[PDB]
Amino acid sequence: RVLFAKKTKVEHRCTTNKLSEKHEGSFIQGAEKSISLIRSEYGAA
Amino acid sequence: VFSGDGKDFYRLSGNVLSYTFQVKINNDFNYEFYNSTWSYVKHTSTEHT
Numbered sequence: 135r136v137l138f139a140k141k142t143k144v145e146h147r148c149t150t151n152k153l154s155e156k157h158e159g160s161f162i163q164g165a166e167k168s169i170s171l172i173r174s175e176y177g178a179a
Numbered sequence: 180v181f182s183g184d185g186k187d188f189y190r191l192s193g194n195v196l197s198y199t200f201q202v203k204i205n206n207d208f209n210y211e212f213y214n215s216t217w218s219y220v221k222h223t224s225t226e227h228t
């Protein structure tokens with residue numbers, strides 16, 4: 135302002151950015167086998 | 180024929196050559212188990228003023 139004349143200018147600006155990525159997992163595998171022989175029929179148990 | 184792992188008695192014949200009382204049994208097993216699990220999560224947030 136100079137002296138009548140008056141001037142005023144105000145500017146405001148804000149920005150915000152956010153990113154969140156999360157991944158959690160588990161996989162399990164297990165195999166077991168057997169084999170046997172027996173050299174009366176009652177013993178088959 | 181004598182009683183071997185069976186009934187009281189058994190009768191063979193001339194054409195039959197042999198009878199056996201040897202009990203032999205075998206076995207085999209193949210068991211499997213598994214599990215496959217997946218988990219994907221994603222998130223985003225943006226604010227402007």
Ligand SMILES: *[C@@H]1O[C@H](CO)[C@@H](O)[C@H](O)[C@H]1NC(C)=O
Nearest residue numbers: 162163164212213214215216
């Ligand atoms: C995951 O694996 C385990 C391993 O024994 C199993 O007991 C369970 O049933 C599985 N779950 C699934 C495939 O959803």
